[PDB]
Design an enzyme around this catalytic site. Structure first.
Site, PDB file in Angstrom:
ATOM      1  N   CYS A 164       0.812  -1.215   0.000  1.00  0.00           N
ATOM      2  CA  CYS A 164       0.000   0.000   0.000  1.00  0.00           C
ATOM      3  C   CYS A 164       0.848   1.269   0.000  1.00  0.00           C
ATOM      4  O   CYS A 164       0.402   2.303  -0.499  1.00  0.00           O
ATOM      5  CB  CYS A 164      -0.949  -0.007   1.196  1.00  0.00           C
ATOM      6  N   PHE A 215     -10.438  -4.296   0.165  1.00  0.00           N
ATOM      7  CA  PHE A 215      -9.588  -4.167  -1.015  1.00  0.00           C
ATOM      8  C   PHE A 215     -10.442  -4.064  -2.271  1.00  0.00           C
ATOM      9  O   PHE A 215     -11.336  -4.888  -2.499  1.00  0.00           O
ATOM     10  CB  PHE A 215      -8.618  -5.346  -1.111  1.00  0.00           C
ATOM     11  N   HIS A 304      -3.127   7.879   2.151  1.00  0.00           N
ATOM     12  CA  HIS A 304      -3.569   6.540   1.849  1.00  0.00           C
ATOM     13  C   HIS A 304      -4.581   5.998   2.839  1.00  0.00           C
ATOM     14  O   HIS A 304      -4.313   5.841   3.979  1.00  0.00           O
ATOM     15  CB  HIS A 304      -2.400   5.558   1.668  1.00  0.00           C
ATOM     16  N   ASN A 337      -9.857   0.336  -0.754  1.00  0.00           N
ATOM     17  CA  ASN A 337      -8.399   0.343  -0.670  1.00  0.00           C
ATOM     18  C   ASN A 337      -7.854  -0.291  -1.942  1.00  0.00           C
ATOM     19  O   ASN A 337      -8.030  -1.488  -2.165  1.00  0.00           O
ATOM     20  CB  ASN A 337      -7.946  -0.417   0.571  1.00  0.00           C
TER      21      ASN A 337
HETATM   22  O1  LIG Z   1      -2.731  -9.076   0.635  1.00  0.00           O
HETATM   23  C1  LIG Z   1      -2.848  -8.031   0.065  1.00  0.00           C
HETATM   24  C2  LIG Z   1      -3.762  -7.746  -1.103  1.00  0.00           C
HETATM   25  C3  LIG Z   1      -3.224  -6.520  -1.834  1.00  0.00           C
HETATM   26  C4  LIG Z   1      -4.082  -5.996  -2.904  1.00  0.00           C
HETATM   27  C5  LIG Z   1      -4.968  -4.960  -2.681  1.00  0.00           C
HETATM   28  C6  LIG Z   1      -5.701  -4.443  -3.681  1.00  0.00           C
HETATM   29  C7  LIG Z   1      -5.565  -5.004  -4.938  1.00  0.00           C
HETATM   30  O2  LIG Z   1      -6.309  -4.525  -5.915  1.00  0.00           O
HETATM   31  C8  LIG Z   1      -4.695  -6.029  -5.174  1.00  0.00           C
HETATM   32  C9  LIG Z   1      -3.948  -6.520  -4.153  1.00  0.00           C
HETATM   33  O3  LIG Z   1      -3.006  -5.470  -0.949  1.00  0.00           O
HETATM   34  C10 LIG Z   1      -2.207  -5.631   0.084  1.00  0.00           C
HETATM   35  C11 LIG Z   1      -1.496  -4.611   0.652  1.00  0.00           C
HETATM   36  C12 LIG Z   1      -0.695  -4.840   1.735  1.00  0.00           C
HETATM   37  O4  LIG Z   1      -0.060  -3.786   2.211  1.00  0.00           O
HETATM   38  C13 LIG Z   1      -0.525  -6.096   2.296  1.00  0.00           C
HETATM   39  C14 LIG Z   1      -1.198  -7.175   1.767  1.00  0.00           C
HETATM   40  O5  LIG Z   1      -1.130  -8.427   2.220  1.00  0.00           O
HETATM   41  C15 LIG Z   1      -2.074  -6.942   0.628  1.00  0.00           C
END
Ligand SMILES: O=C1C[C@@H](c2ccc(O)cc2)Oc2cc(O)cc(O)c21
Ligand SMILES: CC(C)(COP(=O)(O)OP(=O)(O)OC[C@H]1O[C@@H](n2cnc3c(N)ncnc32)[C@H](O)[C@@H]1OP(=O)(O)O)[C@@H](O)C(=O)NCCC(=O)NCCS
Ligand SMILES: O=C1C[C@@H](c2ccc(O)cc2)Oc2cc(O)cc(O)c21
Lengths: 391, 392
Positions: A164, A215, A304, A337
């Site tokens: 993220c 998500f 974010h 998200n």
């Molecule tokens: O396990 C996931 C899924 C990923 C995700 C989110 C949105 C998307 O469209 C695709 C993938 O986001 C993340 C973000 C993180 O910091 C830690 C994580 O474990 C994950």
């Protein structure tokens, strides 16, 4: 110890790296969040887990999310029982989807930015591709190049399994790419799809269920360059300072693993607490560098939206007035998200809304602003931005 | 259209990005290439594949490799039969190894680089970690930062699933970090382990067999900065020009897919052919941008990614290099095999040391200028024009 110096063989630029265009895209399937628990327990054939679905309905009701967009739909999930299970061998069907569809969604977002930008595709010198959704060789950076028909000599940087915070990271990357190379124009693409992460519910993995509530899918795209060509290219935000912080006491806060069952999500510490406990120090340090000092209420905010408690608890700890997070909440409500791509969506809404409400600048009034990425380390990416004046 | 310009908020540097220190590291298990086919076909229960083993023996014999180092060994492979088969679901056991061992081996190389460098590690401002072996969140860049106890505020860049061209990418990446940031000192680490890619043989995927003859393990690390402190830091190579090129008509030449059976390796075009037909055009364009309208290829030093001996042979033939040019590139291939993104840094380190050893005029065997080339999926060719430093 050195031959006599020569002039920089690859000329550099003089002004700040500047956002010249932004485009965004989302997959065609829309999911009302208030009825999503019904759909989710239907498609995962888990309606016998009554108490879990009540827990999930609460999660969704409290997410600050109104709707999400996803490449997955009912038809596609019926065709893959192993992705509807909580923990079944999948990774291969998940990869087959995202290695195709992540460059595709990025292309749709990038085409918009190239179009708004106005210049010919051939002026693109660098490509930065950021995702959390699958990996491949050659990567989605190479695929995006082919899909758009950029020149084969573009310099690419492929950012995989980022998480993220990487919306902030790409800004820091493009800053140096744009400022150190005269005439460089950097195409930055963030593109994320939940197909790697969607899975069935489990009664002993409630953090995995938080992920199912939050998500969404989306792709965002910017063109970054220094020294904009007057009355041809149009600036919107300037990058002036970047910083990176592994927050104190945060080891193991968020883990993610790519497994035979796909990508798994793990929450093990109070993530909003750690961020909101430490965000004061980070921003105070950044502001001393940039200024050495406007108020936190007098700069614009791109934060974010990891989840709502992050924005809430930052708002309180820092005693912000409630419109500062409003644009960040707008995107979370409208999209969910979307990992790295979130902040670039928030930046686009910021500018669009400031134009549409005929305010002074691209950042809703203020000259200076913040862009914050949060994810795994626990990692806080910090960007101090300047906006541009408007009518 | 803009607010009044202000001075750049983060000061920039003025000189070229320079290599200040190099360290390397390998796992402790040595595999003699000449008898590697006996070990490999036995451990994968393939002794009956009599003709395939004869082919694999030829591949090893013509490989230009004397030995490789591997984290894998006999005990580890017997504990994981799903890895000794050609195509079983494994990826989980493979991840459990490499998400731990890749940052570990890189830590080894990074400590050596930092020790040679001689400065406090707290003065490291940037981390670039490059690998093709495994992925994790947080990444090997984060794990490396913890293992080394670097400052919590380092600017990190994690490069996963890169492939064989990425030794040139990190140089390109590091050029802009160092040059656009006064005082920036960048730790660059490439760490590769075959645990992702090892698998039993198949009579119908001899390109997969090729990988099994050529890939080895290693990690390399460099300190990169601009404006070195006189009398304190020691420059070894400067980065003056970087270039990237997808070669013509090369779609599908090298693919690698991360699956439930682990990392799979595919070769579907004449890779040494494609590289050698096109390298002239690539290098000619780079030299015209550095030198104008120009030394000969025999008058520069060469650091070429040794993806296999045919690449080095066919670039040597088509460019008509005298055979000494690729010698350093071939020495690393001989002593280590193909270590993906880590090789070129191994060749860079080998170059400097034998230049110092043989008392040559510069760190690049007495030439002022030279090349670092990486070849990989895409087909991607990464081009770096380097300058050496003079030697007493
Ligand atoms: O396990 C996931 C899924 C990923 C995700 C989110 C949105 C998307 O469209 C695709 C993938 O986001 C993340 C973000 C993180 O910091 C830690 C994580 O474990 C994950
Ligand atoms: C060619 C190479 C694989 C091995 O050495 P070699 O001496 O050329 O092998 P020869 O062609 O002389 O010997 C012929 C046999 O080797 C095997 N072989 C060699 N290259 C092969 C390939 N690309 N695919 C399949 N088999 C191959 C074949 O079995 C072949 O017999 P065949 O007629 O049954 O295919 C190696 O030196 C090389 O550089 N190849 C490509 C470079 C590379 O692998 N890059 C890796 C990139 S990241
Ligand atoms: O499949 C692999 C193995 C990988 C690798 C080599 C050595 C090592 O130690 C670890 C990983 O290198 C590669 C490099 C590529 O460009 C394409 C590939 O398919 C691969």
């Amino acid at each position: 110890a050195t031959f006599p110096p020569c002039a920089r063989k690859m000329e550099r630029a003089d002004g700040p790296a500047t956002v010249l265009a932004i485009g965004t895209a989302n997959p065609p399937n829309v999911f009302d969040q208030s009825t999503y628990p019904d759909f989710y327990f239907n498609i995962t054939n888990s309606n016998h887990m009554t108490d879990l679905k009540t827990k999930f309905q609460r999660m969704c009701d409290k997410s600050g999310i109104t709707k999400r967009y996803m490449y997955l739909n009912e038809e596609i999930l019926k065709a893959n029982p192993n992705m509807c299970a909580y923990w079944e061998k999948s990774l291969d069907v998940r990869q087959d989807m995202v290695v195709v569809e992540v460059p595709k969604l990025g292309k749709e977002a990038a085409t918009k930015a190239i179009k708004e930008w106005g210049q010919p595709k051939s002026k693109i010198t660098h490509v930065v591709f950021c995702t959390t959704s699958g990996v491949d060789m050659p990567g989605a950076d190479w695929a995006l190049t082919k899909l758009l028909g950029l020149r084969p000599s573009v310099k690419r940087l492929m950012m995989y399994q980022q998480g993220c915070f990487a919306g902030g990271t790409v800004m820091r990357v493009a800053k140096d790419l744009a400022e150190n190379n005269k005439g460089a124009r950097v195409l930055v693409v963030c593109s994320e799809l939940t197909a790697v992460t969607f899975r069935g519910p489990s009664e002993t993995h409630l953090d995995s269920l938080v992920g199912q509530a939050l998500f969404g899918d989306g792709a965002s795209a910017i063109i970054v360059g220094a020294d904009p060509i007057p009355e041809v290219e149009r600036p919107w935000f300037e990058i002036h300072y970047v910083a990176s912080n592994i927050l104190p006491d945060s080891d193991g806060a968020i883990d993610g693993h790519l497994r035979e069952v796909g990508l798994t999500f793990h929450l093990m510490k109070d993530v909003p607490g750690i961020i909101s406990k430490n965000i004061g120090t980070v921003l105070k340090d950044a502001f001393e560098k940039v200024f050495g000092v406007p108020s936190y209420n007098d700069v614009f905010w791109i934060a974010h939206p990891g989840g709502p408690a992050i924005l809430d608890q930052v708002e309180q700890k820092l005693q912000l007035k409630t419109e500062k997070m409003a644009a960040s909440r707008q995107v979370l409500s409208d999209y969910g998200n979307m990992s790295s791509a979130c902040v670039l969506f928030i930046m686009d809404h910021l500018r669009k809304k400031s134009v549409e409400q005929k305010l002074a600048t691209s950042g809703e009034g203020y000259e200076w602003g913040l862009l914050l990425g949060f994810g795994p380390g626990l990692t806080c990416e910090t960007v101090v931005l300047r906006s541009v004046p408007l009518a």
